[PDB]
Amino acid sequence: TNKDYYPEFSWKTVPVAFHFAKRNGLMTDKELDFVTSHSNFIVLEKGHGGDIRTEKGIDNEAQRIKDINPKAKVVFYWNAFLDYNLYDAHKEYENHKEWWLKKLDGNYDYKSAKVKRYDLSNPAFRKWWVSIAKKAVVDGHADGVFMDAFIQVINKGNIELWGQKKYDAIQQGLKDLIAETRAAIGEDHLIVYNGIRSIPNRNVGNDFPEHTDAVMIEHFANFQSKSKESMLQDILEMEKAGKTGKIVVFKAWPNEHSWIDKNFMAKPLQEKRKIARANITFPLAAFLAGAQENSYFIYNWGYRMDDGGLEWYPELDKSLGKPLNEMKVHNWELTRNYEHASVWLNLATKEAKINWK
Numbered sequence: 001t002n003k004d005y006y007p008e009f010s011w012k013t014v015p016v017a018f019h020f021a022k023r024n025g026l027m028t029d030k031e032l033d034f035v036t037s038h039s040n041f042i043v044l045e046k047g048h049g050g051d052i053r054t055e056k057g058i059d060n061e062a063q064r065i066k067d068i069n070p071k072a073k074v075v076f077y078w079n080a081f082l083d084y085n086l087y088d089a090h091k092e093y094e095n096h097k098e099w100w101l102k103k104l105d106g107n108y109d110y111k112s113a114k115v116k117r118y119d120l121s122n123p124a125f126r127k128w129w130v131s132i133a134k135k136a137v138v139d140g141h142a143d144g145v146f147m148d149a150f151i152q153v154i155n156k157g158n159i160e161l162w163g164q165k166k167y168d169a170i171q172q173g174l175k176d177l178i179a180e181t182r183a184a185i186g187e188d189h190l191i192v193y194n195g196i197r198s199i200p201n202r203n204v205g206n207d208f209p210e211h212t213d214a215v216m217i218e219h220f221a222n223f224q225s226k227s228k229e230s231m232l233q234d235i236l237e238m239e240k241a242g243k244t245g246k247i248v249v250f251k252a253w254p255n256e257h258s259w260i261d262k263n264f265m266a267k268p269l270q271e272k273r274k275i276a277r278a279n280i281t282f283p284l285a286a287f288l289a290g291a292q293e294n295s296y297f298i299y300n301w302g303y304r305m306d307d308g309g310l311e312w313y314p315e316l317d318k319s320l321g322k323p324l325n326e327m328k329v330h331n332w333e334l335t336r337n338y339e340h341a342s343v344w345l346n347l348a349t350k351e352a353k354i355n356w357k
Contacts, residue, residue, distance in 0.1 A: 005188045007041040007073040017296035020309040021045030036069035043075040047086040062141035076142035081149035083116040099125035103161045120173030134184040144190025182211040198230035206241040214247030222253040228347035235290035242292020252283030252299045259302030285345040285352035289334040
């Protein structure tokens, strides 16, 4: 398959993407200018646009983005497992109790008070779920869909809640959901999925490669993936997925801080920014160690636009150029050479050096 419907990729500087929602309205002209001048790849999150609800917010923003930069690919976030009350589609799902997932005790399956989990083994739900993506992407200005939460679907804790037969049907239902999504949106639209997660003895890789174009590594060097074991596998998985022709979204964090780091989010923006600027080198070097064509670096502390989403860093303006070799692994040390940069990092010590040329 020809991949020209991918976002146009270049090694000229560090390839970056965006993944956020602006929670109270659409982007300003200058916010629009910043994003479109810095990347061709933007995932718009649940809740983007505010009260207009996500479908209209994302459809409107996608127009605004591609009016400025027709090369940008704007992806419609649509959780594969969770019912968030931020869409027009949520009102419809509330009217469809007959699809709702139930647990072994007969209670409806809720992740939290306001968030039901979907019965992926229910084909009536699936046809509806797919129709929402199809309307956003085929009949709207979005170029693709971001299927989130696969990790929570496959979680083996769910066997206790569903039983093995239902758990197996739901895992198969996730596979079919992706196939049906591809069927509905056609061959020229993107499917991004959130799945690579390295947790010791529990690794999840690029395990839904058929029908998908892009895979995200959400937890690099953070959450339960802080171990050198886990960061190595994450980086290796980027390399592997990239070599198969996938887009890889490598989501990085400022020294393990994030929007659920209450102490860090308490700091004033100037300090948050000082910390983020000081801590980009190790995740950036990890990214560059394993990056392939169509690999993208996302570095911020969350998924709101204000979560560092429009911050910029000098490292992201320097000349990089094409990779000159494959990643090299010497125990916990990883190296890579580019036309205008040499990358080295030590996963055991969390130290990194980028020699920009």
